[PDB]
Ligand binder design. Structure first.
Ligand code: AT1
Ligand code: AT1
Lengths: 257, 257
């Protein structure tokens, strides 16, 4: 039985309302739960869904050099495969293997409905509406390094802004938008932006195109015997239209706005 | 010296106007020419850009089961790496290796400006404005195999439409749009649609969102000692913002509309 590590994140993996009366994999529902089933079916293996211990995605401590989250669970041998909204990055690709992207995304802008902002440019040219990002992560690093006037301009602003425009968690950014009465815009991964826009109280919306492009990939350890098959299954699923069908299902068909 | 196989296609690889006075790699310019330079730099190797003999990207003959194009060059050991707008697909991934995608794309709709069509659904509900695709390839196949009502209806229309709505080449499809006075819409890869839209006579435009999602990747023979390194380089370049810089450079900065 293959040990799958994943993370409780909506709408990827969530516990059913009546989960206490259910067993094993049947306790969970979500985009990645359906995806795992598809992958396992096409690859031909039985599996067990396990929630990542520390509830993290995967980063290496610059001091201890220890990997946390799902990535850590793979390199230290606790799980055989990770099926989650795990962004494919250079540092992670150096210690584990990623299938080709099963979902595309990018940095996007979240505003409280009514806010007079339609793009990253609109934000850069004004200050009445504050805007920020997580105090760490690829989004912050993106602006921090962007040599693009519109983005670097936004960076200088964000850094010299008072009070701080940075938040520690995603939930904090989203709440700051909903409670700032239109005076705060939040930069985050488009997938989450699009998802929140379809959830009550339906008071936020995504605007403008994405600022960059990345993808989520299924991960397996170097040399894994699952690596190749998994990659081919992801491609097959996308080509059969299943990936788009699952996106629509969990984001819109189950939407509330 | 690394032997790179590529193909002359705008704005990826093109012979400079004064190419006869230039030599080797210097004869060419474009997105893939710059990308090739960047990859080689980071990976630290010397290379030679060679143009695929048959002018094909990579398809397996159903009868002989022989691969043509750049895929063929890699599969049969004629080239070390392919740097071009080569779509990552299941059938290709089974015979060669692909780096993570360096560019995203999808099937899109090209219309001559003024055409009263905003989406694929719009096209599917009528026949006044004819629409088609290449007489062969993944776009045609996408429609042939789609389970989506709108797309399946579009397929049935295209297959039975007279005169034939299919074209032999990309240039023919675009030309047909431009000379049909808005009575012909062409379905093609978004990247080409967005490029042409920025080119005189500025009489075409992309409408609606893409119908699917895929990407171009750098390819190497299965088990190539270059594969790993090149893949890591692509991720690094995307993280450094170089891939977007190049896209903006060849599509928009050098724009004419
Ligand atoms: C998956 C979800 C949408 C919840 C997510 O939203 N923001 C994230 O990270 C912050 P940043 O994008 O700044 O690194 C992540 C997690 C990210 N995809 C990862 O793989 O670490
Ligand atoms: C890259 C470019 C935009 C020139 C292109 O436009 N149409 C193409 O194929 C036809 P289809 O998409 O029908 O397979 C390709 C080539 C394609 N990316 C491939 O890898 O074969």
């Amino acid at each position: 039985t293959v040990v799958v590590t994943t993370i409780l994140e909506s709408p990827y993996v969530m516990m059913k309302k009546n989960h206490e009366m259910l067993e094993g994999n049947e306790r969970y529902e979500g985009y990645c739960v359906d995806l795992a089933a598809e992958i396992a079916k096409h690859c031909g293996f039985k599996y067990k869904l396990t929630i990542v211990g520390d509830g993290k995605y995967g980063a290496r401590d610059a001091d201890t050099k220890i990997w946390n989250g799902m990535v850590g669970e793979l390199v230290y041998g606790k799980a055989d495969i990770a099926i989650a909204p795990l962004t494919i990055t250079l540092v992670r690709e150096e210690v584990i293997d990623f299938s080709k992207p099963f979902m595309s995304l990018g940095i996007s802008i979240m505003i409280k409905k009514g806010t007079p902002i339609e793009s990253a440019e609109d934000l850069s040219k004004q200050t009445e509406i504050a805007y920020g990002t997580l105090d760490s992560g690829s989004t912050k690093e993106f602006f921090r390094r962007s040599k693009i006037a519109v983005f670097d301009k936004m960076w200088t602003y964000m850094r010299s802004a008072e009070p701080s425009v940075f938040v520690r968690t995603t939930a904090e950014g989203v709440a700051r938008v909903r409670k700032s009465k239109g005076k705060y815009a939040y930069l985050l991964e488009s997938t989450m932006n699009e998802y929140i826009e379809q959830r009550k109280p339906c008071d936020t919306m995504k605007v403008g195109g994405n600022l960059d492009s990345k993808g989520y990939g299924i991960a397996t350890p170097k040399g894994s015997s699952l690596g190749n098959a998994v990659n081919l299954a992801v491609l097959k699923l996308n080509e059969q239209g299943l990936l788009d069908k699952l996106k629509n299902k969990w984001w819109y068909d189950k939407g509330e706005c």
